Short mmCIF file of C-alpha atoms and ligand atoms in Angstrom, two decimals:
data_model
loop_
_atom_site.label_atom_id
_atom_site.label_comp_id
_atom_site.label_asym_id
_atom_site.label_seq_id
_atom_site.Cartn_x
_atom_site.Cartn_y
_atom_site.Cartn_z
CA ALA H 1071 -13.02 15.53 8.53
CA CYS H 1072 -13.21 13.35 5.50
CA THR H 1073 -9.70 11.99 3.91
CA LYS H 1074 -10.57 9.81 1.36
CA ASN H 1075 -10.06 10.81 -2.59
CA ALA H 1076 -12.53 7.87 -3.78
CA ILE H 1077 -12.15 6.84 -7.33
CA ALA H 1078 -15.87 6.34 -9.45
CA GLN H 1079 -16.48 3.38 -11.34
CA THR H 1080 -14.16 3.59 -15.07
CA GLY H 1081 -17.10 4.00 -17.28
CA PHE H 1082 -19.49 5.24 -14.90
CA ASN H 1083 -22.86 5.35 -16.46
CA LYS H 1084 -24.71 8.88 -15.87
CA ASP H 1085 -28.11 8.90 -17.20
CA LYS H 1086 -28.59 5.01 -15.84
CA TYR H 1087 -27.88 5.58 -12.49
CA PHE H 1088 -29.24 9.33 -12.94
CA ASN H 1089 -31.99 7.70 -13.74
CA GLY H 1090 -35.01 8.97 -12.34
CA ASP H 1091 -35.57 5.87 -9.33
CA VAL H 1092 -34.60 5.21 -5.93
CA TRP H 1093 -31.96 4.37 -4.57
CA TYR H 1094 -32.29 2.57 -0.75
CA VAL H 1095 -28.77 2.54 1.67
CA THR H 1096 -28.33 -0.98 3.11
CA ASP H 1097 -25.05 -0.15 4.39
CA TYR H 1098 -23.18 1.62 5.95
CA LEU H 1099 -19.40 2.43 6.91
CA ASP H 1100 -18.86 5.46 8.83
CA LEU H 1101 -14.78 6.58 9.06
CA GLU H 1102 -16.00 8.54 12.26
CA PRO H 1103 -18.19 6.85 13.53
CA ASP H 1104 -19.76 8.80 17.11
CA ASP H 1105 -19.11 7.33 20.35
CA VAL H 1106 -22.62 7.58 20.25
CA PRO H 1107 -23.27 6.49 16.56
CA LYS H 1108 -27.48 7.67 15.17
CA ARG H 1109 -28.53 4.52 13.54
CA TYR H 1110 -30.54 6.43 11.12
CA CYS H 1111 -32.25 4.93 7.95
CA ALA H 1112 -31.19 6.99 4.15
CA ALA H 1113 -32.27 6.68 0.61
CA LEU H 1114 -31.88 8.76 -1.85
CA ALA H 1115 -33.09 9.83 -5.70
CA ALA H 1116 -30.83 10.67 -8.69
CA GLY H 1117 -32.54 11.82 -11.86
CA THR H 1118 -31.72 15.25 -14.61
CA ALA H 1119 -34.15 17.56 -14.38
CA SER H 1120 -34.05 20.51 -17.13
CA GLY H 1121 -30.53 18.66 -17.82
CA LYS H 1122 -29.37 19.23 -14.08
CA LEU H 1123 -28.60 15.96 -12.09
CA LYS H 1124 -30.28 16.25 -9.60
CA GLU H 1125 -30.57 14.63 -5.71
CA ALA H 1126 -33.39 14.14 -3.39
CA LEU H 1127 -32.19 12.55 0.47
CA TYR H 1128 -34.96 11.36 2.75
CA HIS H 1129 -32.45 10.23 6.23
CA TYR H 1130 -35.31 8.21 9.24
CA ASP H 1131 -34.33 7.18 12.37
CA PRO H 1132 -36.40 4.50 13.62
CA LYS H 1133 -36.21 5.41 17.48
CA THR H 1134 -35.90 9.44 17.91
CA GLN H 1135 -38.49 9.98 14.14
CA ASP H 1136 -36.44 12.41 13.62
CA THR H 1137 -37.06 12.81 9.49
CA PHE H 1138 -36.11 15.10 7.02
CA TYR H 1139 -35.44 15.43 3.00
CA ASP H 1140 -33.31 17.73 1.00
CA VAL H 1141 -33.21 18.08 -2.17
CA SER H 1142 -30.21 19.51 -4.71
CA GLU H 1143 -28.50 20.25 -7.33
CA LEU H 1144 -25.63 18.78 -8.49
CA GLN H 1145 -22.38 19.93 -10.25
CA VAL H 1146 -19.70 17.56 -12.39
CA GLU H 1147 -15.91 17.31 -10.79
CA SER H 1148 -15.56 14.75 -13.67
CA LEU H 1149 -17.46 11.38 -14.28
CA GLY H 1150 -19.08 9.76 -11.23
CA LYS H 1151 -17.85 12.18 -8.41
CA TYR H 1152 -19.68 15.44 -7.42
CA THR H 1153 -20.02 18.32 -5.38
CA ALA H 1154 -23.83 19.12 -3.93
CA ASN H 1155 -25.47 22.25 -2.50
CA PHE H 1156 -28.08 20.59 -0.57
CA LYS H 1157 -31.50 22.52 0.91
CA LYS H 1158 -33.41 21.35 3.71
CA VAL H 1159 -37.02 20.66 2.39
CA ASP H 1160 -40.28 19.65 3.36
CA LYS H 1161 -41.40 15.69 2.31
CA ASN H 1162 -43.35 18.16 -1.14
CA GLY H 1163 -40.21 19.91 -1.56
CA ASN H 1164 -40.94 23.13 0.29
CA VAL H 1165 -37.38 25.28 1.27
CA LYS H 1166 -37.06 24.93 5.60
CA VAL H 1167 -33.16 25.27 5.27
CA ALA H 1168 -32.26 27.27 2.00
CA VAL H 1169 -28.77 26.57 0.31
CA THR H 1170 -25.63 28.20 1.87
CA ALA H 1171 -21.93 27.86 0.76
CA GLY H 1172 -20.35 25.02 2.90
CA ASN H 1173 -23.15 23.34 3.25
CA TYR H 1174 -22.66 20.65 0.63
CA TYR H 1175 -21.47 16.89 0.65
CA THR H 1176 -18.83 15.24 -2.43
CA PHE H 1177 -20.69 12.03 -4.05
CA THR H 1178 -18.38 9.42 -5.59
CA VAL H 1179 -19.99 6.63 -7.45
CA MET H 1180 -16.99 3.71 -6.84
CA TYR H 1181 -19.10 1.30 -8.41
CA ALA H 1182 -22.86 0.57 -9.81
CA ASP H 1183 -24.80 -1.48 -11.88
CA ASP H 1184 -28.68 -2.43 -12.67
CA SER H 1185 -29.40 -3.24 -8.82
CA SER H 1186 -26.89 -1.91 -6.72
CA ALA H 1187 -24.28 1.08 -6.42
CA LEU H 1188 -21.52 1.79 -3.87
CA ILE H 1189 -20.75 5.59 -3.34
CA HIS H 1190 -18.48 7.58 -0.76
CA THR H 1191 -19.25 10.91 0.65
CA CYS H 1192 -17.84 13.22 2.06
CA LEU H 1193 -20.50 16.12 4.35
CA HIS H 1194 -19.79 19.25 4.99
CA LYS H 1195 -22.45 21.27 7.40
CA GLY H 1196 -21.27 24.54 9.11
CA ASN H 1197 -18.81 24.39 11.62
CA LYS H 1198 -19.92 20.61 11.98
CA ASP H 1199 -16.42 17.85 12.05
CA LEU H 1200 -17.57 15.32 9.95
CA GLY H 1201 -16.16 11.74 8.09
CA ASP H 1202 -16.34 10.19 5.03
CA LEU H 1203 -18.80 7.86 4.90
CA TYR H 1204 -19.07 4.12 2.52
CA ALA H 1205 -22.30 3.39 1.22
CA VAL H 1206 -23.89 0.22 -0.63
CA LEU H 1207 -26.88 1.27 -2.21
CA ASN H 1208 -29.92 -1.55 -4.05
CA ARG H 1209 -32.96 -0.96 -6.30
CA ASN H 1210 -34.83 -2.68 -3.33
CA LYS H 1211 -35.08 -2.20 -0.34
CA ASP H 1212 -33.39 -4.81 1.85
CA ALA H 1213 -32.16 -6.52 -0.32
CA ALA H 1214 -29.18 -8.92 0.49
CA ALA H 1215 -25.85 -7.59 -1.05
CA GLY H 1216 -24.95 -9.23 -4.41
CA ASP H 1217 -21.83 -11.01 -4.71
CA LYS H 1218 -20.70 -7.47 -7.91
CA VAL H 1219 -21.70 -4.62 -4.97
CA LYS H 1220 -19.56 -6.95 -2.26
CA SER H 1221 -16.40 -7.62 -4.64
CA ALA H 1222 -16.38 -4.14 -5.31
CA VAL H 1223 -16.42 -3.46 -1.64
CA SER H 1224 -13.29 -5.27 -0.93
CA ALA H 1225 -11.52 -3.89 -4.69
CA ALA H 1226 -11.74 -0.62 -2.64
CA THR H 1227 -9.95 -2.24 -0.33
CA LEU H 1228 -12.46 -2.02 2.41
CA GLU H 1229 -14.05 -4.87 4.41
CA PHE H 1230 -17.66 -5.93 3.53
CA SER H 1231 -17.57 -7.00 7.69
CA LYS H 1232 -17.13 -4.02 8.83
CA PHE H 1233 -20.38 -2.09 7.49
CA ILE H 1234 -23.69 -1.43 9.22
CA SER H 1235 -27.02 -2.80 8.00
CA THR H 1236 -29.91 -1.02 8.16
CA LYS H 1237 -32.28 -3.67 7.10
CA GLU H 1238 -33.08 -4.92 10.12
CA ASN H 1239 -33.70 -1.53 11.29
CA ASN H 1240 -37.75 -1.39 11.14
CA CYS H 1241 -37.33 1.15 8.10
CA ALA H 1242 -39.39 2.97 6.31
CA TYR H 1243 -39.07 4.87 2.86
CA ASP H 1244 -41.19 7.99 1.45
CA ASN H 1245 -40.05 6.37 -2.05
CA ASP H 1246 -42.40 8.54 -4.03
CA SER H 1247 -42.25 11.90 -1.79
CA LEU H 1248 -38.24 11.31 -3.47
CA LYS H 1249 -39.02 11.15 -6.62
CA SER H 1250 -40.93 13.87 -6.90
CA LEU H 1251 -38.74 15.74 -5.04
CA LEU H 1252 -36.77 15.92 -8.20
CA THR H 1253 -37.69 18.96 -9.88
CA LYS H 1254 -37.65 20.78 -6.85
C1 HEM L 2265 -27.75 4.31 6.98
C2 HEM L 2265 -26.60 6.19 5.92
C3 HEM L 2265 -26.84 6.75 6.94
C4 HEM L 2265 -26.14 7.42 8.20
C5 HEM L 2265 -26.57 6.60 9.24
C6 HEM L 2265 -26.62 9.09 8.08
C7 HEM L 2265 -27.01 9.50 9.30
C8 HEM L 2265 -26.16 11.29 9.17
C9 HEM L 2265 -27.08 12.09 10.31
C10 HEM L 2265 -26.78 11.82 11.57
C11 HEM L 2265 -27.28 13.20 9.68
C12 HEM L 2265 -26.89 14.96 10.97
C13 HEM L 2265 -25.64 15.17 10.21
C14 HEM L 2265 -25.88 16.33 11.45
O1 HEM L 2265 -26.26 17.82 11.73
O2 HEM L 2265 -25.06 16.40 12.83
C15 HEM L 2265 -27.57 12.89 8.88
C16 HEM L 2265 -26.94 14.73 7.85
C17 HEM L 2265 -26.72 14.63 5.86
N1 HEM L 2265 -27.02 13.55 5.44
FE1 HEM L 2265 -26.75 11.60 6.24
N2 HEM L 2265 -26.38 9.41 6.50
C18 HEM L 2265 -26.41 8.60 5.63
C19 HEM L 2265 -26.60 8.57 4.80
C20 HEM L 2265 -26.02 9.78 3.32
C21 HEM L 2265 -26.08 9.91 1.98
C22 HEM L 2265 -26.03 8.19 1.17
C23 HEM L 2265 -26.37 10.88 1.87
C24 HEM L 2265 -25.55 11.46 0.61
C25 HEM L 2265 -26.29 10.58 -0.75
C26 HEM L 2265 -26.69 11.31 3.14
C27 HEM L 2265 -25.92 13.33 3.45
C28 HEM L 2265 -26.42 14.34 4.43
C29 HEM L 2265 -27.04 14.93 3.94
C30 HEM L 2265 -26.18 16.19 2.94
C31 HEM L 2265 -26.81 15.62 5.37
C32 HEM L 2265 -27.02 17.57 5.77
C33 HEM L 2265 -28.92 17.49 6.00
C34 HEM L 2265 -29.90 18.82 6.40
O3 HEM L 2265 -28.98 19.71 7.45
O4 HEM L 2265 -30.48 19.35 5.52
N3 HEM L 2265 -26.09 11.11 3.91
N4 HEM L 2265 -26.63 12.50 8.04
N1 HCS L 2266 -20.54 11.86 7.39
C1 HCS L 2266 -21.78 11.49 7.86
C2 HCS L 2266 -21.87 10.91 7.49
C3 HCS L 2266 -23.62 10.73 7.41
S1 HCS L 2266 -24.42 11.88 6.12
C4 HCS L 2266 -20.84 11.68 10.11
O1 HCS L 2266 -19.90 12.44 9.61
O2 HCS L 2266 -22.11 11.91 10.45
#
């Protein structure tokens, strides 16, 4: 279960974050890691399509090859805090699993600038029991975390040394599909 009420960045710039470009997860902190953690790579595009906030997600497990995409409309709870009903889609946006109540994640932007971000997310999916996840994002895949985002990790009272890096995972990313999914 999730346990954190993450605080959104003061002065969060939504238009800059939701600009249609891609964010890569470079490091993450899972508060309830499984006994045997599945080391996935992940990226997202966040944008506005016809006035609606949207996110497209990409997950890739470089060992199992499991690969899946999602698209969500985001609903606003407050500035920088969203609730997202996801639908699983193929890379082209064709629906594989429809939106359903109880399948959603919350998403809080704790820090963001031009090139980096720190987010919190809580996933709810069926009758699964999932926990909090923090993620460091960068506009450049596998970019080393800079001082601004690392300081934000500290200011959130988290220890960056506890985060798991994706940068040495032999990750590959379908960024063109992520961008085009924003309309789907
Ligand atoms: C490296 C970072 C991440 C890892 C290691 C990771 C891992 C996973 C895993 C193992 C699952 C399968 C859950 C299950 O069904 O048992 C999953 C699903 C999911 N994750 Fe992540 N995740 C990451 C980042 C993110 C981010 C940043 C978001 C939201 C912005 C997100 C949203 C979701 C959603 C919505 C699903 C369910 C998709 C579906 O069933 O259609 N994940 N992730
Ligand atoms: N909260 C998720 C992290 C990946 S989205 C989990 O419990 O595995």
